[PDB]
A and B are shown apart, each in its own frame.
Chain A
Amino acid sequence: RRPYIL
């Protein structure tokens, strides 16, 4: 589980 937002 990791950020999807950049």
Chain B
Amino acid sequence: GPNSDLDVNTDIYSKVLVTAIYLALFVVGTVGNSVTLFTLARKSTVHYHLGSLALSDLLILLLAMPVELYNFIWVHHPWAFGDAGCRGYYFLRDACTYATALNVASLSVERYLAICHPFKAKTLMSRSRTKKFISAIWLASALLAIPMLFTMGLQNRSADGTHPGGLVCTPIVDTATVKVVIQVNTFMSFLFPMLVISILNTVIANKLTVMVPGRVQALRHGVLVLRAVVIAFVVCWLPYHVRRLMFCYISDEQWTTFLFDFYHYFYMLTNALFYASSAINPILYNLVSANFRQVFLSTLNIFEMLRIDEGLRLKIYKDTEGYYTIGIGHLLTKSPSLNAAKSELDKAIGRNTNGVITKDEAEKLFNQDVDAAVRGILRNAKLKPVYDSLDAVRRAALINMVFQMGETGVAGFTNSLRMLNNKRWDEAAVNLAKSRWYNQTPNRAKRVITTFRTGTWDAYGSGS
């Protein structure tokens, strides 16, 4: 036959398996991302990025999966969508690919700022700049896909010069360009976003762990999700860009019937995983938020520690030393004047409180104070290297001290600090337990000392 070599040899099982899979991903991903859009619409800046991500993934399924399933899984030749179809389909495939790539990446950069740079995030961001940001990543996505309009194209590969059943869509340009094009795709669609996602997520994950049983269980799944997101990206997208690079980097000299046959099976695997990304993303990225169980499934360390040690009160009290305090250990003033406090409390939040506040207002204060303590530690020579060397749990204990006594108070524990720095847990504990601190607040200090000497939550059985 004149096209007989363009025949792809693959098990009919295999073709029936991948099809069943493909369509399974297709409903779950079309529904999930639709329902996601339906859910997000009826609801700071993450909600738009999640929606942008939802679209980009919905489009991968609707634009890429149908033609691939006809023309790449079953009927390999001929290409039944003409030359412009060939150019339009790889363009649109690539565009959505970049959109998802740039969305996932942006979404991580967005949550990096929210949690590690909340000052900027507040003043130097809004829902205007967000939509300016999102416009840019379809604008850019569409831009980056343009090469595909010129490198792809129809071609008659049949042994005879031209026979209608041997037309194929394929890179119809020299390998010096096609290798270059495919390695820009790989770099911008995978590596750049790999570095971004893998780094920032892990940085966010670590910071979030130190920040954060029932009341904070949401945030602890969020951490696991943050790490899951990276594994998900790698596994679903790495084989896809291997196959695209293998396509162009193996020379016609080295190609063999076996390799030819391998590739087309590898195609079934790689692309099935690729479509998985779009299907799971809506579920993975929306897990952390409340209403997950609800919305999709209808369609069928420092906070805890201080919450215990400082407690929570809504009226003004006098702390251990006798100073007017409110909420989660927020010292209002050292004055003995009960009015002077009320004045400073109204100033604090910005309204005539009369010495009483709401839980939201207490938790807003807390975060400002913890921010303050952590900046305190990171900006201090005597505290940064100690903190840097400690694990998530012991870091929190160091913050408990700074929250209680201040940055320059804790800098006074010159040797107890050195000992923690050098993992001499027992010696630190004994020397810490001989302090004025320990005398004033034995219960709290002993829990904090236990935390330093164990690295566990043994002290905080009362946590909720």
Chain A interface (Cβ < 8 Å from any Cβ of B): 1-6
B34 to chain A, nearest CB (A): 29
Q: B396 contacts the other chain (Cβ, under 8 Å)?
A: no
Q: B170 contacts the other chain (Cβ, under 8 Å)?
A: yes
**Per-residue contact bits, chain B 136-154, to A (CB 8 Å; 1 contact, 0 not):** 0000000000000000100
Return 30 A-B CB contacts under 8 Å, by A number: A1-B5, A1-B255, A1-B257, A1-B260, A2-B250, A2-B252, A2-B255, A2-B260, A3-B247, A3-B260, A3-B267, A4-B6, A4-B76, A4-B77, A4-B155, A4-B157, A4-B168, A4-B169, A4-B170, A5-B8, A5-B72, A5-B76, A5-B168, A5-B170, A5-B267, A6-B90, A6-B152, A6-B171, A6-B244, A6-B247
B59 to chain A, nearest CB (A): 19
**Per-residue contact bits, chain B 51-76, to A (CB 8 Å; 1 contact, 0 not):** 00000000000000000000010001
Q: Which A residues touch B152, using CB under 8 A?
A: 6
Q: Interface residues of B toward A: which range?
A: 20 to 34
Query: What separation, in Å, do the CA atoms of A3 and B5 have in the docked complex?
Result: 10
Query: What separation, in Å, do the CA atoms of A4 and B152 have in the docked complex?
Result: 11
A6 & B260 in contact (Cβ 8 Å cutoff): no
Q: B307 contacts the other chain (Cβ, under 8 Å)?
A: no
Query: What separation, in Å, do the CA atoms of A2 and B257 have in the docked complex?
Result: 8
Q: Which A residues touch B81, using CB under 8 A?
A: none
| 12 more CB-based (< 8 A) A-B contacts, given A4-B157, A5-B267 | A1-B5, A1-B257, A1-B260, A2-B252, A2-B255, A3-B264, A4-B6, A4-B77, A5-B76, A6-B152, A6-B170, A6-B171
B94 to chain A, nearest CB (A): 11
**Per-residue contact bits, chain B 226-255, to A (CB 8 Å; 1 contact, 0 not):** 000000000000000000100100101001
Which chain B residue shows the least CB distance to A5?
B72
**Per-residue contact bits, chain B 68-100, to A (CB 8 Å; 1 contact, 0 not):** 000010001100000000000010000000000
Chain B interface (Cβ < 8 Å from any Cβ of A): 5-6, 8, 72, 76-77, 90, 152, 155, 157, 168-171, 244, 247, 250, 252, 255, 257, 260, 263-264, 267
B315 to chain A, nearest CB (A): 69
Query: What separation, in Å, do the CA atoms of A3 and B90 have in the docked complex?
Result: 16
B266 to chain A, nearest CB (A): 10
Query: What separation, in Å, do the CA atoms of A6 and B72 have in the docked complex?
Result: 9
A1 to chain B, nearest CB (A): 6
Which chain B residue shows the least CB distance to A6?
B247
B263 & A3 in contact (Cβ 8 Å cutoff): yes
A5 to chain B, nearest CB (A): 5
Q: Which B residues touch A6, using CB under 8 A?
A: 90, 152, 170-171, 244, 247
B180 to chain A, nearest CB (A): 15
Q: Which B residues touch A3, using CB under 8 A?
A: 247, 260, 263-264, 267
Which chain B residue shows the least CB distance to A2?
B255
Query: What separation, in Å, do the CA atoms of A3 and B77 have in the docked complex?
Result: 11
Query: What separation, in Å, do the CA atoms of A1 and B168 have in the docked complex?
Result: 14
Query: What separation, in Å, do the CA atoms of A6 and B179 have in the docked complex?
Result: 12
A-B pairs, 5 with minimum CB distance? A4-B170, A2-B255, A4-B168, A3-B263, A5-B72
Which chain A residue shows the least CB distance to B71?
A5
Query: What separation, in Å, do the CA atoms of A2 and B155 have in the docked complex?
Result: 14
Q: Which A residues touch B6, using CB under 8 A?
A: 4
Q: Which B residues touch A2, using CB under 8 A?
A: 250, 252, 255, 260
Query: What separation, in Å, do the CA atoms of A1 and B155 have in the docked complex?
Result: 15
Query: What separation, in Å, do the CA atoms of A3 and B264 have in the docked complex?
Result: 8
